[PDB]
């Protein structure tokens, strides 16, 4: 029950974000497409990451969040997460398995 | 390595939000204040737990977040979380310990 260090807050935040995207509507209205985009932009301005190698502010303004659909948003967030993985020497996550991981459970039934 | 259940998603999101508030500026600009207000508003529309989001939307529309300062916002978020605690039968968190819990660590160097 101590303050989150970078690693712990990261783990909290990916879990929240990927779950957010997993339950985002398959067919979002324009207003929802715009709320989610805006949400991700505001997130980029406030996420605590002092002296982080990933400049997420700049990253979110260059490769803008694609909030057209659940799968678009899901895949965009997965690519973002993989950019952070690369800088940190963590292996690439296979983005095609994003639903198994965060919504449905691995096909092997272990969830 | 499996999808978040309601309890897991919850633990991660609070950690993320209290930490977000803990690193919010002491004297934020009018634009930061408005951004954070909007962030929370959109959050309440999209939080993946359906029952949970309808619940917090109605609590947030009742008392909008005070994003005036790190203190106001952190405390506001503490009070919001204590409402969910009460509904769920969990103990009250002493909001005077919030800075210690999510920012500075316990005054006794326990962290
Ligand atoms: C926006 C953001 C920026 C960050 N920037 C930095 C930084 O610059 N420097 C730094 O040191 N730390 C940064 N962090 C924290 C860091 O990314 C990790 O969270 C932390 O290092 C813990 O790593 P981990 O090995 O526990 O797994 P995490 O990266 O936290 O991943 C947790 C789980 O998500 C799943 N996962 C992994 N990759 C993907 C993917 N591509 N798509 C979907 N699911 C995936 C895996 O199952 C993994 O176990 C950042 C975190 C966030 C949210
Ligand atoms: C916005 C939101 C709405 C939710 N709505 C529901 C719902 O309607 N129904 C439901 O069943 N679950 C809901 N949840 C999930 C639920 O609140 C808990 O997260 C979950 O039950 C796990 O609780 P926990 O005992 O592990 O501790 P959590 O409540 O998840 O808290 C995690 C840690 O935060 C610290 N903490 C506790 N209270 C405070 C506080 N008030 N201020 C600062 N720090 C604190 C404590 O150290 C605690 O160990 C919601 C979660 C969120 C984020
Ligand atoms: Cl509009
Ligand atoms: Cl809107
Ligand atoms: Cl922005
Ligand atoms: Cl901006
Ligand atoms: Cl910006
Ligand atoms: Cl911008
Ligand atoms: Cl977890």
Swiss-Prot record, chains A, B:
What this protein catalyses is:
2 R'C(R)SH + O2 = R'C(R)S-S(R)CR' + H2O2
Keywords assigned by UniProt? Disulfide bond, FAD, Flavoprotein, Growth factor, Mitochondrion, Oxidoreductase
Compartments it resides in: Mitochondrion intermembrane space; Mitochondrion
Residues annotated as binding FAD: 6-14, 18, 47, 78-90, 101-102
Q: Which cysteines are joined by disulfide bonds?
A: 49-52, 78-95
Which intervals hold domain ERV/ALR sulfhydryl oxidase?
2-102
MF terms from GO for this chain are: flavin adenine dinucleotide binding; flavin-dependent sulfhydryl oxidase activity; growth factor activity; protein-disulfide reductase activity
What general EC class does the enzyme of this chain belong to?
oxidoreductase
Per its UniProt record, the required cofactor names are:
FAD
Catalytic activity, EC = 1.8.3.2
Q: Which GO terms describe its biological process?
A: cellular response to actinomycin D; cellular response to lipopolysaccharide; cellular response to toxic substance; cellular response to tumor necrosis factor; liver development; liver regeneration; mitochondrial disulfide relay system; negative regulation of apoptotic process
Q: What does this protein do?
A: FAD-dependent sulfhydryl oxidase that regenerates the redox-active disulfide bonds in CHCHD4/MIA40, a chaperone essential for disulfide bond formation and protein folding in the mitochondrial intermembrane space. The reduced form of CHCHD4/MIA40 forms a transient intermolecular disulfide bridge with GFER/ERV1, resulting in regeneration of the essential disulfide bonds in CHCHD4/MIA40, while GFER/ERV1 becomes re-oxidized by donating electrons to cytochrome c or molecular oxygen. May have a function in liver regeneration and spermatogenesis.
Q: How does it assemble?
A: Homodimer; disulfide-linked. Interacts with CHCHD4/MIA40.
Name of the featured protein: FAD-linked sulfhydryl oxidase ALR
């Amino acid at each position: 029950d101590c303050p989150q260090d970078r690693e712990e807050l990261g783990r909290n935040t990916w879990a929240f974000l990927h779950t957010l995207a997993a339950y985002y509507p398959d067919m979002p209205t324009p207003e929802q497409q715009q709320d989610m985009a805006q949400f991700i932009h505001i997130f980029s301005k406030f996420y605590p990451c002092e002296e982080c190698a990933e400049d997420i502010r700049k990253r979110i303004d260059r490769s803008q969040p694609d909030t057209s659909t659940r799968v678009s948003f899901s895949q965009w967030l997965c690519r973002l997460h993989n950019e952070v993985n690369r800088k940190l020497g963590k292996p690439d996550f296979d983005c095609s398995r994003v639903d198994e991981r965060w919504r449905d459970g691995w096909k092997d039934g272990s969830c």
